[PDB]
Design a protein around this ligand. Structure first.
Ligand SMILES: *[C@@H]1O[C@H](CO)[C@@H](O[C@H]2O[C@H](CO)[C@@H](O[C@@H]3O[C@H](CO[C@H]4O[C@H](CO)[C@@H](O)[C@H](O)[C@@H]4O)[C@@H](O)[C@H](O[C@H]4O[C@H](CO)[C@@H](O)[C@H](O)[C@@H]4O)[C@@H]3O)[C@H](O)[C@H]2NC(C)=O)[C@H](O)[C@H]1NC(C)=O
Ligand SMILES: *[C@@H]1O[C@H](CO)[C@@H](O[C@H]2O[C@H](CO)[C@@H](O)[C@H](O)[C@H]2NC(C)=O)[C@H](O)[C@H]1NC(C)=O
Ligand SMILES: *[C@@H]1O[C@H](CO)[C@@H](O[C@H]2O[C@H](CO)[C@@H](O)[C@H](O)[C@H]2NC(C)=O)[C@H](O)[C@H]1NC(C)=O
Ligand code: CA
Length: 475
């Protein structure tokens, strides 16, 4: 049963890895339709690094070794493209760090070369060292788009909420492993402004804050509240930091609780045609935006994690409703894969989708699917927290649908319309998170228990970064 399913996920992973190694390694990614290569992540081989933690958990030594050898020859000081502090941190930094914690712990007997493993920490340090000037601003809030050769930047005046609040986990982990407090201090100082929002008008409801921060003074520049892309990650890390070290980050938890409760009381939303479904809305100045994104579906998992860690049945109950809502967007389409964005505002239902809306509870704004893992991510937590088999089945149903409609001879491709036969047309694109997240969460849902699995209560010894890279907790 599960064993056969777990092995099936490993085959899908091996499939994409073979195509990637065959046509793109060591470039950042494989172009699944033309069987070529692209470098959307500065060219240090993003798909290889992102795949590391997944390969280690799957016990594929050949894959791990090939990746470790490539990590040793990477020169993080050279790139012809501007670098995103956020993307580089959640994929590359967390990817090598995760590999290190896993191979140094639960997977200690998977590889021989101890030097290639230690190299993961060394290179993580070198990467942080080349990027840290980003934090050298008046407030401490970094510039996200930088030029590492000429320490210049975007010229931007503000930094986004998620790009600012989704760095603390991996930069603090680096400090804890190296003994050098500089990394923790830089990221945490940046995070401090998010924990004590100013002006007060930028925090419409307790715990819910604006979407952008002034780099000059660290004050919020707007009052738009949301869990969508650009905001999401901030809230996710609030509770995850508490799991990492409850003694050091109790304040992060308190802040997440406020956010969680205010979200339940104010952002909770039900479609007119389907009062039984629950999605989250966005809030600006007393006005509500009745639309969401696939990205936002990470929300169910957040409520479930905090729910089990804090023993709050109400957060668990609400997380399950969010999970049900996201599952609804998946099983209502022709391909059984959910849309990238949707709405449920009765006043804006497109004429050509009127009847779909009336029965499904929403209309599709963008029917593309770019191999995102957020829905499967939350299904995974729902299964770990409740132990109910139905959530594992939903993970499998989604995985089979992805395998059946996105698979190409070399890997998996993004799709243009999840509500058309065979997904419409395929995009010549395969993001790094296919390896890091879609394949890992799908496998974990059917694989055996182990330290790296999400646990209930206070038993977690690993915590997942936003790119699904398992980081060992402090102490
Ligand atoms: C396509 O997507 C659909 C939408 O997600 C999905 O529909 C169902 O999804 C869930 C399937 O398990 C289902 O959730 C369960 O609902 C149970 C019944 O709810 C009814 O009674 C309660 C009263 O308690 C009312 O509040 C509801 O409005 C409704 O009338 C509920 O009993 C159950 O709760 C138990 O289990 C959870 C853990 O699983 C525990 O935490 C809890 O304490 C209970 O022990 C759970 O909430 C959901 O209601 C339903 N959605 C809808 C709108 O139909 C389809 O299954 C899916 N289709 C396919 C083929 O995959
Ligand atoms: C990052 O800054 C460096 C400056 O050191 C840029 O380097 C280039 O600058 C000019 C761009 O047309 C040319 O003189 C060369 O291409 C190169 N010269 C230097 C100064 O090294 C680099 O372009 C910047 N990176 C990008 C692409 O934004
Ligand atoms: C995912 O898709 C692959 C390829 O379509 C499935 O594997 C196939 O492998 C061979 C053709 O590539 C054939 O043997 C079959 O078409 C199929 N494998 C089987 C079951 O015989 C793979 O099964 C799909 N994954 C799942 C579990 O649905
Ligand atoms: Ca994420």
């Amino acid at each position: 049963s599960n064993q056969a399913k777990a092995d099936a996920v490993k085959e899908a992973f091996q499939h994409a890895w073979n195509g990637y190694m065959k046509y793109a390694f060591p470039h950042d990614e494989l172009t699944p339709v033309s069987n070529g290569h692209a470098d959307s992540r500065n060219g240090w081989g993003a798909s290889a690094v992102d795949a590391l933690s997944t390969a280690v958990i799957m016990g594929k030594a050949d894959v791990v070794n090939a990746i470790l050898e490539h990590v040793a020859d990477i020169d993080f000081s050279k790139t012809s493209d501007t670098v995103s502090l956020f993307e580089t941190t959640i994929r590359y930094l967390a990817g090598m760090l995760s590999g290190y914690d896993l191979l140094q712990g639960p997977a200690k007997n998977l590889v021989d070369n101890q030097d290639l493993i230690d190299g993961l920490l060394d290179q993580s340090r070198n990467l942080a060292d080349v990027l840290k000037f980003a934090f050298d601003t008046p407030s401490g809030v970094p510039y996200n788009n930088i030029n590492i050769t000429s320490h210049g930047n975007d010229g931007a005046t503000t930094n986004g909420l998620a790009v600012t609040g989704t760095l603390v986990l991996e930069w603090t982990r680096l400090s804890d492993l190296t003994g050098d407090e500089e990394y923790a201090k830089l990221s945490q100082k940046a995070e401090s402004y998010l924990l004590k929002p100013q002006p007060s008008s930028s925090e419409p409801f307790p715990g819910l804050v604006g979407s952008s921060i002034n780099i000059n003074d660290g004050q919020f520049a707007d009052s738009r509240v949301s869990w969508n892309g650009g905001d999401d990650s901030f809230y996710e890390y609030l509770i995850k930091m508490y799991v990492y070290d409850p003694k050091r980050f109790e304040t992060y938890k308190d802040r997440w609780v406020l956010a969680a409760e205010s979200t339940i009381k104010h952002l909770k939303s039900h479609p007119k045609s389907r009062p039984d479904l629950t999605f989250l809305s966005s809030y600006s100045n007393r006005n509500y935006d009745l639309s969401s994104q696939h990205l936002t579906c990470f929300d169910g998992g957040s409520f479930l994690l905090g729910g089990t860690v804090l023993d709050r049945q109400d957060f668990i109950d609400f997380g399950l409703e969010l999970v049900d809502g996201c599952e609804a967007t998946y099983n209502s389409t022709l391909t059984k894969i959910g849309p990238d964005s949707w709405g449920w505002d009765p006043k804006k239902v497109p004429s050509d989708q009127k009847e779909f809306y009336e029965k499904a509870g929403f209309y599709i704004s963008s029917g593309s699917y770019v191999l995102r893992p957020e829905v499967i991510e939350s299904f995974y937590y729902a299964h770990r927290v409740t132990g109910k088999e139905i959530y594992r089945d939903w993970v499998w149903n989604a995985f089979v649908a992805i395998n059946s409609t996105c698979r190409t001879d070399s890997g998996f491709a993004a799709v243009s319309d999840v509500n058309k036969a065979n997904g419409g047309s395929k995009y010549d694109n395969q993001e790094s998170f296919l390896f890091a997240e879609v394949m890992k969460y799908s496998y974990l849902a059917h694989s055996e228990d182990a330290a790296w699995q999400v646990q209930k209560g206070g038993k977690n010894t690993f915590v997942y970064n936003t790119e699904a890279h398992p980081i060992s907790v402090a102490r």
